[model samples]
Target chain A: TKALISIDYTEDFVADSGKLTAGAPAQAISDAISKVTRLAFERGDYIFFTIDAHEENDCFHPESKLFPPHNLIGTSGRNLYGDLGIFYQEHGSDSRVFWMDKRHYSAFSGTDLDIRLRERRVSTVILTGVLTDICVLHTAIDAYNLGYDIEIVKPAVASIWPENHQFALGHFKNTLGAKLVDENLNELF
Target chain B: TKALISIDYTEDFVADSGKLTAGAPAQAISDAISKVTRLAFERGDYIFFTIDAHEENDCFHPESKLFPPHNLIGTSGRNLYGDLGIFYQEHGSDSRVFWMDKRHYSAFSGTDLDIRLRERRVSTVILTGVLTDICVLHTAIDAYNLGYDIEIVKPAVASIWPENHQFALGHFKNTLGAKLVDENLNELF
Candidate 1:
């Protein structure tokens, strides 16, 4: 089963993040959950959601009460039990969807994501999330470095610049031996 | 004349940059001046050094008497004209070599680096330095963006990883027009 992972599914990371990208705070939660679960249900791909949930706050978020340009300062006040999670709960209707939150890193660090993947007898992982150049890039590269067969969805993510986006994607596929695909795996399979 | 360009000489953007590197303090400094003038004196190409300097006055920097990672804190302090600059002025053989300072955005902004390139009538700028992902990548993109014919010296520049470096090199050449060279103009006519 294929799983889609959402790295920053929380009130803090998503705060004011919407303002910078003009992204719907609602859609990120919905899209992330739907991204994996929908494909898993339709194509038997295991849906997984990985969040960069840190105990001490992460992504090196700027320390301030004000929203810095290109940084999050305000919150949608969306709590875990409310807004985003509710949508994730709805879209992730299939039982195959899984969630993981690792502190300061990715699913691979201090989390049981690996065992879960192995339990599913899964070898390949697909990554999609924000801060593509930072977290997404980190997870993808770490997975590659650790010998996981992986693919990065280019169109599925964004970066501060198109250059950073392409750089991370190319580095993953070319340097680390991961595949970068743009379309539905079901079609290819 | 031989031309040497220092790359990624700045390093403030990364979140946890606590001397994670053994830092070639002297090599980094000496190389910039030596390569620029020494090579130029020997009938070599133009020399250009880069700095990934950033605005430390961001919200991220501590409110205390602290600055961000690579914010040209003491421009005069780090100026090549000081320690590095003295060496070049004393031992530098090439009078035409141009050492430069670059802000995070690229050599094009915050400083007159772009105009300096034109003043030297540099047709191609060979790139190098640290944080291969940041300064090296940004300048190359800018070089291509600003319509300067560009090539990168792969071995001469590095980041936290080779894959990261290669990824950037490949991305620019593939997505943008920058060329990759093993050595500066030293390799080919």
Candidate 2:
């Protein structure tokens, strides 16, 4: 089995009203996610999403910080952004889908994702989401080092910081050997 | 019929030794060209390349310039990089392919690309190459406005400036309705 992972497709990340939208082509990423998500569901592949749901001031935050409080708990910013949000609203409780919220970048850090994928015999991770250089890069690195075949859907992910996004994609494809692919998940599924 | 257009994939733009190599994922772009070029050859599709060939102290260049003297005519910097060069070396004489040198951003500004594509009955333009925010974006806009069905092979095109790259891709997809796909070419073709 394989897993389709969406990283930080939250309102705070993809929506305009959030703290940092990256002002990327959110619509394209959303459309890609929607397509991949539906295909994954149809194939009964495991689907997972990671969000940066934060509280007032945990260790990841300080009294004052470089980043404003974003994806704050219970705030609209912390919710899933577009069509994916509707997917969650309708099918979040499905046993095959997992929503892993994190305090830091990598979803696997102190999360059950690694074990969960192991249990499902998932060796390939189709990764998508935002902050391409930050969160996506970190997660991709962790996945590669763990011996998982990483496939990053290009149009399905982005970074508000474009340089980081490009750098991250290059590193993942060239340095890490992650397959840079389209939102089409047929081969993956 | 569809045409594969590589925009500004020159040494000055892509190679590390060139003037503006902010480590813009040249290897990936090169790999894309190699794949697309081979497929275009097999399918008998038109293959076109745009190079930002320039001269010293031309209108586009000044004594004080944003970039170092680059892509000077008859210089290695002005030539195509990697495998595309090999393909051109072998098949540039084929009327199906063209190596265009542009003085400015948009390839159509004064070039015969529009008429050339039209003459060949090429209605769809599959665009690839460097500086997603600059040359790629400008050329994409012109192609869109000129009524070519624009399709950007996402991984095959990039920007040293990632923000511009992402923005350009978004604009091409959302505003201009350019199809964003991988280098596979099978779907779009």
Candidate 3:
């Protein structure tokens, strides 16, 4: 079967006043991300919300030196943004839906994400998330290394810079050999 | 300590008559790549020639269906291009210089690269290679996830598409938090 990974789609990455916000570009994808996620859930595809979790003044964390505090524990910044939050509230306890905390940009690093996917015999992974060139890009590369067939949800992923976003899409298609699809899961030409 | 990884700078990926050539861009980096590799060797840093080794008609390999056959094992296609080849021939038998064969784009994947790095306590990796957005980019992402400080040799890396090269450089500096450096290993602004 297939799995869908929702990476770092939290308030700190998408909302207007977020700590490490992708701002307008990330905010714009809320509908597309929410729609694709819900559709994947309805289709019996496993859904994973891999959100970033960090501590205050985390000197030991590499990102602490690179970015401002974001997605900190015990804060609204870590909450799922927009309709995604509502959807999680409704069916979060379902066996197919998972909430995972990741310390690094790639969801697979230091996590049992690979083990869980292997447990369900998931050979393909659909990627959707914020900061397309950062967390999403890292996760895509990791998935490629792990031998997972990759599908990137185009409208469901966003980056702060338009050029970076375009570049990431190109990398996903040309480098990782990923198929790009729309929110409806239709392949993009 | 530091290590310099020379990734897939072979005939099939660089020569004018290469099977899957990056053409002029890859050829142009010959001087920079050679100089940097030799300088790293002289400075007591470990140098690794991580070249691709592929089999003919390997139906089970993922890349078999993606691209045409290149870098075939036991073929001249896997030979290092230009002056870099000369450097390898001279210092190849040295204890610090290594020749590693990788099946995947990332040097760390399915290889003892990480183990070797850890054994030497090499915390920083200097990356130089072809296809800036493919192999080099994958290796950089893996290095970041593995907690290694990264340095990208901008002039020593090339891709067929200039835009993709620029994008990979951007991702290296911004997302992976890598230091962009010249062939002399001096940090670039």
Tell me, by lDDT, which candidate is best.
Answer: 3
Residue-level lDDT of model 1, residues A5-121, one tens digit each, is: 555545444445443342443234444433443454566666666654322234343211123232222334323323436646675665676666554334565677777777777
Clashing pairs in 2: A22-A160, A162-B162, A162-B163, B132-B158
- On lDDT, the stronger of 2 and 3 is 3
In candidate 3, what are the lDDT values of residues A1-189, reduced to their tens digit?
Answer: 589999998888888999999999898999999999999999999999999999988788878888888898999999999999999999899999999999999999999999999999999999999878888998998999999999999999999989989998988897778999999999999
Which residue segments of model 1 deviate by more than 4 Å?
A9-37, A54-87, A91-95, A186-189, B1-189
Single out the weakest 10-residue window by summed lDDT for candidate 1 chain A: A62-71
Model 2 interface Cα RMSD in Å: 17.0
* lDDT (Cα, tens digit) per residue for candidate 3, span B1-189: 999999999999999889899999999999999999998998999999999999998888878878899999999999999999999889899999999999999999999999999999999999999889999989998999899999999999999988889888988887788999998989999
Per-model lDDT: 0.51, 0.75, 0.93
Q: Which sections of candidate 2 miss by over 4 Å?
A: A59-64, A186-189, B1-189
lDDT of 2 by residue, A140-184 (tens): 756754668888888888876566567667666644567787767
Sliding window of 10 residues with minimal summed lDDT for model 3 chain A = A56-65
lDDT of 1 by residue, B85-120 (tens): 454565446555555565333555456767777776
Against the true structure, candidate 3 reaches a TM-score of 0.97
Candidate 1, residue A94: how far the Cα is off, in Å: 5.5
Winning candidate number (DockQ): 3
